Structure formats: structure tokens, C-alpha cells
């Protein structure tokens, strides 16, 4: 009798600070085209499955939690390092029964305070900070705030042509697969040399084992606070470089200067940190916090309805009382006609019908989609995605990722939820943030 072999029911830990956007369909792009802007009209209807999008942009405090975690563990490594310290109580290398185990950090053992720390401990602590020779500003060294994380390409491990068994690479019985045909694939690795220099590489080699879909990255994660200065020549933006990521008043403000690589590192750290804090029922396959796709971003921005040019119900950019609905550049040289010159505190304007805040304004938002002028037509309509893990030797033009949404300077057009904007994955601007997203574990009814 075919009764069925079900599995033990799991649990859905609704992530903190996120809302649930329902699955739905939307017509990506603006149907009517402004001829004065030269662009034609490019629209394609899509459908996206339900996911968890963060309520607001990542604030300065939320990214400072990341940089503090990276700091703490690097400091713990230095304390365990025989060179700086050598305590060995911060690096659990053997289990309570005495057998060798994978070396991990002892997060229970507190980091000594600046006063109580001895010479070795104080040396380990200070070996990660930077003291400015002239101004005596003891700040975290930007090139030492590096995050080492690993990403397994589940997508690329599933392609038919990327099957480990050569016979399974072609289901056509008329096609005889050469026994020794080489399938060259690339994998992004990164290793700290003896000097201490981050060595990133893209290893191209024939498909041999599952160790070829594992991409290892060591990304410096400290925000580029000099974007405020570099992005605006001949301007008094020296103060936001020294204030934005450091001042306690600028904690709820969206983080700026975060590059695409740093955003991916932050989302991966968030994923593994969430996993560390939640017990998994046996067999639990939990998804990872990820940067939203272009299609998912546009869907959640326009509240699913294809009639919405903006993240608000009407087409006007201003309420009936005269209050703007976003943080952008309303007029010529008038960034602060909406009340805010630079980005504003998150959750300062009205949200969507979904509940998303600052969905078009404040800072533009990184997406996980590689940028292509024909990108909308080259990607499928089921959870659309144009993913391109660029190689270290690729042309710099191939490293563009879509930055969808408007910033505190985007004019009405660039704040429209259907206007594509891009920027290089390497650079981080003073008007670009991000918003980690994760796929919803949802089994709901229909409409």
C-alpha cells in the first residue's frame, strides 16, 4: 500500500528585521519611454517566488557588527598565534576527550581589556589597529579587516555538463561521450601568503571533484570611508568621511562605501552567523542571506503591481500636503528639498504596501545580477537571475553589477523602480548601500 514516507516537520525561523514578500508577477521595466533620455523601452514580464527582503537598508551599526566580528576573531587568532601571543586557550584544537579536532576559536574566552591585557595580549590587540602617525587616531586598519569565507556553487554543481561522471554528462543515447574529454571550469580561491598579502586566483582546471565548485574569497570588508571625498570633487565632504561610519548619531543611517564584494561577504557572514545561532532539526537545509536579484528587487519595490512607477501607490513624487515620498534630488542643486542632503535615518518615510522602507531613495542598493544592456532578455522569467562570477583576469567592464534603486542624489528617474543603474563590483560609492535577502521557506495557498 502506497501511504507515503514523509519527513520530520521542520521549523521556519522568520528572520529578524525582515518582511515576507508574496510570490507574484510583474512587468520589469518602464513601458513608456522618455525620448529625450535617448533610451528605448525594454519591458519583460516575470515571476518571482516568495522571499525575505530586509525591511530597511543595512545600517552603519549592522555593518559595524560585521567588522567587529571580523576584528574579534582576528584578534583571537593573534592571541592564539605563537608569534604575537601563544596562549592556545583561544584556539580549541582538541576535544574534551583529548582527540585532535578541527581547530576552532574559543569564543567563550573573553578578549582581555586594554588595561588588564599583558604585553603579549596588548601586542596582539594592537597588531590589528592603525595609529595615525600625525593625528594619533587609533582606527581599525582597513587592509586587515579581511573576511575569509567559502561559497559552494550549488548552481554550477547541478548543470548537466558539470557532472562528475562523464557518462552522465549527456542523456542522449546517440551521443558517445569521449571517456577522457576535459571539462575546463574555473573556481575563485584566495590564500594568505607568508608575507601576509591576500592572494586571490581563479583556478581553471579540468573537472575532477566537488572541490572545483567551492569558491574561497578573502575580502577586506572595512567600508571605503573615502568615497565621500572621491565621489564629489570640490566639495566639503571631509566630515562624512570622519563621521558617517564612526559617529554614534550615524548608526541607523544606511551604510555607504560598501562594494559588491563586501556586500556579498556581509551577506555570507550573516548567513553563517544565523546558522551558528539556530539549532537545525536533522536534515535541515536552510538557505543563506543573499544579495537580492534585480528582478526580485524590482518586484518588491513596486509592490508587485505593474502599474507602479515608484514604490508608492500614486505616480506623484510628493504627497498632497507637500511632503516628498523619498530621499532624492528633487530640484537642481536641491538635494535637501526633501529634508535630507546626505542619506537619512532608515524608516524615515512611508514604506510600501509590503512594508519595505527607503525602497527608492537614501542609498542605491546593490543587486546580485551582473549588468548587461540586454540583460532583461537574456535571463529566464522564473526567478530571473543573470549571475556572472567574474574571473580575476577578466576585463574590468565584465565586473559590472546592477545597482537598482535611487539614492539621495538620483533624480526622479533614477529613483524609479524600473530604471537600471550599474556600478563596478570592485568600487563602493557614498550613495550605494545594499539589503541582504533570503528565499522564504513558504508553503502558502493561492491568491
Amino acid at each position: 500500500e502506497l501511504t507515503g514516507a514523509k519527513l520530520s516537520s521542520w521549523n521556519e525561523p522568520s528572520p529578524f528585521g525582515m518582511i515576507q514578500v508574496p510570490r507574484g508577477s510583474i512587468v520589469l521595466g518602464n513601458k513608456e519611454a522618455d525620448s529625450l533620455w535617448g533610451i528605448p523601452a525594454e519591458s519583460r514580464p516575470i515571476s518571482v517566488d516568495a522571499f525575505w527582503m530586509d525591511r530597511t537598508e543595512i545600517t552603519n551599526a549592522q555593518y559595524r557588527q560585521f567588522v567587529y566580528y571580523v576584528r574579534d576573531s582576528i584578534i583571537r587568532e593573534r592571541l592564539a598565534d605563537p608569534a604575537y601571543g601563544g596562549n592556545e586557550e583561544y584556539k580549541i584544537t582538541e576535544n574534551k576527550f583529548g582527540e585532535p579536532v578541527t581547530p576552532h576559536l574559543d569564543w567563550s574566552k573573553p578578549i582581555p581589556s586594554e588595561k588588564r591585557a599583558t604585553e603579549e595580549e596588548i601586542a596582539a590587540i594592537n597588531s590589528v589597529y592603525y595609529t595615525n602617525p600625525v593625528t594619533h587616531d587609533r582606527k581599525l586598519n582597513p587592509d586587515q579587516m579581511v573576511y575569509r569565507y567559502e561559497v559552494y556553487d550549488y548552481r554550477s554543481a547541478a548543470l548537466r555538463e558539470h557532472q562528475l561522471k562523464a557518462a552522465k554528462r549527456n542523456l542522449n543515447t546517440d551521443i558517445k561521450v569521449d571517456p577522457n574529454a576535459v571539462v575546463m571550469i574555473s573556481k575563485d580561491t584566495a590564500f594568505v601568503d607568508e608575507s601576509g598579502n591576500i592572494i586571490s586566483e581563479t583556478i581553471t582546471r579540468p573537472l575532477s571533484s566537488e572541490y572545483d565548485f567551492l569558491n574561497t574569497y578573502i575580502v577586506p570588508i572595512y567600508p571605503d570611508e573615502t568615497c565621500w571625498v572621491n565621489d564629489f570633487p570640490n566639495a566639503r565632504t571631509e566630515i562624512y568621511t570622519r563621521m558617517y561610519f564612526n559617529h554614534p548619531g550615524y548608526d541607523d543611517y544606511p551604510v555607504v562605501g560598501i562594494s559588491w564584494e563586501q556586500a556579498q561577504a556581509f551577506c555570507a557572514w550573516r548567513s553563517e552567523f544565523f546558522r551558528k545561532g539556530i539549532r537545525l532539526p536533522e536534515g535541515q537545509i536552510m538557505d543563506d542571506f543573499r544579495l537580492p536579484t534585480e528582478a526580485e528587487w524590482e518586484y518588491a519595490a513596486r509592490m508587485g503591481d505593474s502599474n507602479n512607477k515608484y514604490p508608492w501607490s500614486t505616480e506623484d513624487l510628493r504627497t498632497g500636503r507637500g511632503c516628498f515620498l523619498g530621499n532624492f534630488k528633487p530640484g537642481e542643486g536641491d538635494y535637501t528639498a526633501d529634508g535630507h542632503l546626505i542619506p537619512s535615518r532608515v524608516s524615515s518615510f512611508s514604506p510600501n504596501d509590503f512594508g519595505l522602507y527607503d525602497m527608492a531613495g537614501n542609498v542605491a542598493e546593490w543587486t546580485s545580477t551582473a549588468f548587461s544592456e540586454s540583460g532583461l532578455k537574456q535571463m529566464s522569467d522564473i526567478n530571473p537571475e543573470l549571475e556572472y562570477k567574474a574571473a580575476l583576469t577578466d576585463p574590468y567592464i565584465l565586473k559590472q553589477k546592477v545597482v537598482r534603486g535611487g539614492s539621495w542624489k538620483d533624480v526622479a528617474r533614477f529613483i524609479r523602480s524600473a530604471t537600471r543603474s550599474h556600478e563596478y563590483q570592485n568600487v563602493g560609492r557614498s550613495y550605494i548601500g545594499f539589503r541582504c535577502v533570503r528565499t522564504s521557506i513558504a508553503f502558502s495557498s493561492g491568491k
Binding site: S35, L36, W37, G38, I39, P40, E42, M184, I185, S186, T202, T204, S372, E373, S374, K377, Q378, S380, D381, I382, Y388, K389, A390, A391, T393, D394, L398
Partner: protein, 254 residues
């Protein structure tokens, strides 16, 4: 190209293998019309500024493009129909003088004599297909045929096609250089590959893969008749897509 780029391009290939519906139609993109002049922008090569025909001519001059003869009636892309460059220059009347071959350029052709500004239209073979895996209609460019808008004195405009260019052969060399799509925004932000992939070209259907291998010209005496027939074919191609989906029907609210 890096292996990552190669894998990306392999993913970005349209597979019209098991499509339940296909429709092969030929267009006559006139470059002397806006939205189709992107392929004519530089009538004559200007340093690093070249139109499609100039790029194609240079590519064939370097044995880097496999183009096939314009056979009236059909488009067989076989090694038999690979064109002979010297014959092409001679038969269409192009004055060339052979320079140092250096295995780079077969014949030295002066830019003044390259018929790059007379090719004022293109035959575009595009194959509308219904994707079997996600039920989506898409257009796949098969080949482009540069037609030289020549002048036959007694016979005035001759409009004789030159050759047929399989699109996958020309795609690598047109997916890199940037062009401006509009005359109002002169930003070189997209490529001609994007122009063809987004179907930004505007052309009148001059032939469909008919069962009698008949072209519109045969049963349409005057240009207006060809215009209305092309409109009819466009309306039926659009009606296919319209009839596929049923979310616009309101017969239920009755």
C-alpha cells in the same frame, strides 16, 4: 576570453531544439531610417569608429569571418558556399591592390573603395521560437545579409545582396565595441550585439519560410502591397503571442 566568460556565453545561448513552435521570417532593415542607422553610424571607418559593413569587410579580409554567398531562394550554410574574397571583390567591382600579405590581410582595399557607405540595408533572418521549457516566445537571429544599394545607371538602384553572415560567426566581434543607439543620447553604452539581441532594428518582412518558398515580392506588385503584407505577417506573429495567454480575457466577469 576567460573560462568564466566562455561558460557565461554558453549559458547565454538560445536553444531552439525542441521548440513546439518556430517561425522563420526575413526582414529588410533599411539603415537609412532611424533605429536602424546604428549599423551605419560611421559610413566610412574613422580611426576606431567603424560601421557593421566596414567591420565585416575587415574581418573577412583577415580570414576571421565565414560568410556565404547570397543564393536567391535559400540560405544553405555549408563549406561548399563559402565565398572567395577575390571573386567577391572582382564580381561586385571593387578595385583592390594586393599589399604585403603577412598572413594578416588578403588584399589591401582603400577605405574610399570599401562599399561601406552604400550598404544601406540588411536582410536579417530571425527565427521566432516558442521555448519548450518555460513557454516563452523569443527571437533568435540566424544570419544577416549586407545588401549593397548600388546604382545601375539604366537600372537605377540595384540593391544586390552581397553574402550571408551566420550570426554566431559575427557575434564575438560585435559584442565588444560600444555604439550609441540614439541621436538624442550619445552615450556609447551598448553594443551592436545588444542592438540585435533586443531587436531594436526596425524592418519590413520580405520573406517567410513558406511551403512554396515564395517571397512577398512575387505576389505583391507594388511597394504598398508589400507593406500591407508585411503588416499582416506582423499582426499574425503578434496574434500568436496574444492567443498564448489568457490573463487579458474578461469573458468571466460576464
Amino acid at each position: 576570453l576567460s573560462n568564466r566568460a566562455q561558460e557565461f556565453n554558453r549559458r547565454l545561448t538560445q536553444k531552439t531544439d525542441n521548440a513546439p513552435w518556430r517561425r522563420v521570417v526575413y526582414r529588410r532593415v533599411d539603415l537609412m531610417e532611424e533605429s536602424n542607422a546604428v549599423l551605419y553610424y560611421p559610413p566610412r571607418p574613422i580611426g576606431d569608429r567603424k560601421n557593421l559593413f566596414s567591420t565585416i569587410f575587415g574581418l573577412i579580409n583577415s580570414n576571421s569571418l565565414d560568410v556565404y554567398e547570397y543564393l536567391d531562394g535559400f540560405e544553405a550554410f555549408t563549406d561548399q558556399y563559402k565565398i572567395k574574397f577575390q571573386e567577391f571583390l572582382d564580381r561586385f567591382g571593387i578595385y583592390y591592390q594586393p599589399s604585403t600579405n603577412k598572413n594578416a590581410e588578403l588584399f589591401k582595399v582603400a577605405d574610399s573603395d570599401i562599399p561601406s557607405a552604400e550598404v544601406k540595408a540588411y536582410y536579417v533572418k530571425e527565427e521566432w521560437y516558442f521555448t519548450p521549457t518555460n513557454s516563452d516566445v523569443d527571437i533568435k537571429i540566424q544570419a544577416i545579409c549586407p545588401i549593397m544599394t548600388g546604382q545601375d545607371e539604366f537600372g537605377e538602384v540595384r540593391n544586390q545582396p552581397l553574402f550571408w553572415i551566420p550570426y554566431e560567426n559575427i557575434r564575438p566581434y560585435i559584442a565588444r565595441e560600444r555604439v550609441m543607439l540614439s541621436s538624442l543620447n550619445n552615450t556609447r553604452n551598448s553594443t551592436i550585439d545588444d542592438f540585435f539581441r533586443l531587436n531594436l532594428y526596425k524592418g519590413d518582412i520580405v520573406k517567410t519560410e513558406n511551403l512554396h518558398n515564395r517571397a512577398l515580392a512575387e505576389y505583391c506588385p507594388t511597394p504598398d502591397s508589400m507593406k500591407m503584407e508585411s503588416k499582416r505577417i506582423d499582426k499574425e506573429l503578434q496574434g500568436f503571442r496574444d492567443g498564448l495567454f489568457v490573463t487579458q480575457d474578461t469573458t468571466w466577469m460576464k
